[PDB]
């Protein structure tokens with residue numbers, strides 16, 4: 047029969063486009079290997095006329111594509127692009143309403159943890175190393191978050207519909223961000239073992255598990271020492287744009303102007319629901335597309351974010 051061809055573009059980054067002549071006899075899979083159009087898998091689909099001039103993602107099967115992919119995503123995981131595309135096929139159908147001047151996500155597929163992560167990222171100063179996240183984060187801030195959400199899912203190895211932990215999600219994202227200048231100095235004091243000082247850099251400089259209260263962390267927290275006597279750990283020095291204080295969910299009171307934003311978590315381990323509390327002129331509770339306002343808050347909180355620049359203790 048007649049051999050028909052169209053010109054299309056292939057890519058791994060949607061920056062470097064590569065002109066290809068495709069036979070309309072054969073599947074994309076027979077000519078490129080696994081191929082995606084706007085996240086949708088077309089590997090086993092024959093080219094349509096409407097495809098002419100369109101861009102298709104392909105797996106890097108040569109050194110040029112492998113390098114462009116690594117430079118863009120900062121990963122060599124062979125399944126990364128397929129997972130990104132599979133997730134994108136879903137997140138492009140989500141609604142991203144502007145709620146309180148920020149981009150949120152209307153609830154679907156257990157995406158409350160992503161909505162809360164996305165709302166937190168918009169409030170804190172953060173530069174991503176992968177251009178993929180830089181580029182998608184810039185679009186997410188402008189209200190176009192489908193790509194950013196699909197990259198978060200891909201980078202965090204989460205299925206669409208699986209409930210995730212906001213603290214684990216932020217931890218992954220922080221590990222792909224420039225925090226080289228973030229520094230934390232801790233002092234642990236025991237009656238027996240004396241005073242020992244530790245300096246933490248990067249992700250460990252901005253995250254703490256065991257208290258929601260920045261003020262309590264500064265005053266001092268009780269931790270088990272090596273000897274088995276209780277010891278006091280306190281913050282001596284903090285240099286970072288923000289700090290993230292996490293703990294297992296507990297009834298907490300949030301007061302206007304004493305924090306930036308917080309993760310509320312109702313329900314049981316791995317099957318609950320996240321809401322985002324933010325401090326503006328009053329306390330805002332952002333629940334996907336749903337918004338409520340209150341002068342004060344009491345609820346089960348698991349993450350609190352406070353802004354920072356430089357803090358030095360007055361203790362000793």
Ligand SMILES: Cc1ccc(NC2CNC2)cc1C(=O)N[C@H](C)c1cccc(-c2ccc(CN[C@H]3CC[C@@H](O)C3)s2)c1
Nearest residue numbers: 209210211214294295296297311313314315316317346348
């Ligand atoms: C949602 C989710 C997904 C995946 C994972 N995976 C693992 C962590 N990495 C691998 C976790 C969670 C999770 O649920 N996190 C919350 C913050 C959380 C964290 C820690 C503990 C708990 C809880 C314990 C008990 C609970 C029931 N309710 C309590 C809380 C308030 C009080 O009045 C009753 S929730 C949750």
Ligand SMILES: [Zn+2]
Nearest residue numbers: 236239271273
């Ligand atoms: Zn001790």
